[PDB]
Amino acid sequence: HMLEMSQERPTFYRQELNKTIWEVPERYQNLSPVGSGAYGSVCAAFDTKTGLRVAVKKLSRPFQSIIHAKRTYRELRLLKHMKHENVIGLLDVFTPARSLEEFNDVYLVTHLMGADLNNIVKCQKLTDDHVQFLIYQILRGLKYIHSADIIHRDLKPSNLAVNEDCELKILDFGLARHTDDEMTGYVATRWYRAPEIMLNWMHYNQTVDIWSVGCIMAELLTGRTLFPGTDHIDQLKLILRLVGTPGAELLKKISSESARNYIQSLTQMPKMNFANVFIGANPLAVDLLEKMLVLDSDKRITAAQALAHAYFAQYHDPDDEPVADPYDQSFESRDLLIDEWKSLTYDEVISFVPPP
Ligand SMILES: c1ccc(C[C@H]2CN(c3cc(-c4ccncc4)c(-c4ccc5ccccc5c4)nn3)CCN2)cc1
């Protein structure tokens, strides 16, 4: 029954990095910008308190609009909830402000990652063992994320951080939107997206993430993008060629009448033989792929079910694949003013409890 009734404010020091003034607790030393403005405003640093090499991100204009203030709040809530080895988590969150009145900047902290799945693949030839272990971690983390009723929505190699020990973490959740223009043409931003979400056929569920894993797995196994469409339509054709054209069941599930009309306009095609598409691949991997790359999302294998697939026999441990605590997203359907979103954010910042 021993409780803390107050919080000791750290001593902050300020310096100019990333053309901007960074103000952080003294525990964070030797800050050096990284990612070349690509990760955003991120500085690599050494957390002297934990003896950990960390990534410190400074949110830029988190409350410049109602849309952004809510996004900032959404990100913080998400990052604070994530507690899994295969998912990006929060080591610390802070602001130099002593009060809400002076609240403006938000700094986030996590483990420093070296490279994403793309960099890994570019540097060496991965063994099936590597692919096995990599996809295992993705599904282990997906099971957790999905158990909290969260959907990544933008799962792709650039959103998977990997280390020297082939350990992987899922990051950059797609909770906001992807400008339909950055989804235009011959772009990797669209190659891993489920068709139903790429063309807006219906209300997508968490299985859209499984489709993405299938795309990633196939590519790790063949070394080739599975559906490198030059545009949405070219990509859909690439997809139906492999998995066959929709049956009546799925057809009735597509809400857009125009989309339905369009679908029926295509010459019907049967599902291809994956054993002949993925020549020389492990028969177990081919089976799993067929279970993931199913056009009707309702029949796609779940992350939980996938982990129990014989293909992961060497890594599967039902007692070591954790689920998440309930995640309240009621705020998503909530309407608030900028300052109200900002207040909710500030509340979350000052109430942060570091990992044990
Ligand atoms: C390594 C890993 C992945 C890539 C591709 C990667 C590059 N991008 C990134 C990257 C990072 C990052 C995470 C960990 N260590 C360094 C950078 C963050 C970031 C930085 C600080 C944070 C602090 C608290 C919470 C979350 C945080 C997220 N945001 N966007 C965008 C997506 N692809 C490149 C190199």
Ligand 1 centre from 341 Cα, in Å? 25
- Three-point CA angle 176, 180, 184, nearest 5°: 135
> CB-based contacts of 345: which residues, under 8 Å, 6+ apart?
62, 63, 69, 72, 73, 76, 106
Q: Kindly report the protein residue whose alpha carbon is nearest to atom 18 of ligand 1.
A: 39
Ligand 1 centre from 247 Cα, in Å? 41
Active-site residue, from 172, 231, 234, 296: 172
Q: Is 157 left (phi over 0), alpha (psi -120 to 50) or beta?
A: alpha
Is 79 touching ligand 1 by the criterion CB < 6 Å? yes
Binding site listing for ATP: 34-42, 57
Is 39 touching ligand 1 by the criterion CB < 6 Å? yes
Verify whether residue 92 is a known catalytic residue: no
* Structural contact between residues 145 and 88, judged by C-beta atoms closer than 8 angstroms: no
Atom index in ligand 1 nearest the CA of residue 114 equals 1
Q: Kindly report the protein residue whose alpha carbon is nearest to atom 22 of ligand 1.
A: 57
Is 158 touching ligand 1 by the criterion CB < 6 Å? yes
Q: Kindly report the protein residue whose alpha carbon is nearest to atom 4 of ligand 1.
A: 116
Burial of residue 167 (CB within 10 Å: 0-12, 13-18, 19+) is: middle
Ligand 1 centre from 39 Cα, in Å? 5
Ligand 1 centre from 44 Cα, in Å? 10
Phi, psi of 19 (to 5 degrees): 50, 10
* Structural contact between residues 163 and 111, judged by C-beta atoms closer than 8 angstroms: no
Is 263 touching ligand 1 by the criterion CB < 6 Å? no
Amino acid at 139: L
Distance CA 324, CA 200 (A): 29
CATH architecture of 1-114+324-353: 2-Layer Sandwich (3.30)
Q: 335-338, long-range: CB within 8 Å, 24+ apart, which pairs?
A: 336/66, 336/70, 337/66, 338/63, 338/65, 338/66, 338/69
Is 93 touching ligand 1 by the criterion CB < 6 Å? no
> What is the structure's resolution, reported in angstroms to one decimal?
2.0
Residues of the chain with CATH 1.10.510.10: 115-323
Residue among 109, 108, 82 at smallest CA distance from 171: 82
* Structural contact between residues 122 and 182, judged by C-beta atoms closer than 8 angstroms: no
* CATH of 115-323 given 3.50.50.60, 1.10.510.10, 1.10.645.10, 3.30.460.10: 1.10.510.10
* Structural contact between residues 112 and 57, judged by C-beta atoms closer than 8 angstroms: no
Ligand 1 centre from 202 Cα, in Å? 31
Residues of the chain with CATH 3.30.200.20: 1-114+324-353
Is 116 touching ligand 1 by the criterion CB < 6 Å? yes
- Residue 9 CB neighbours (<10 A): 10
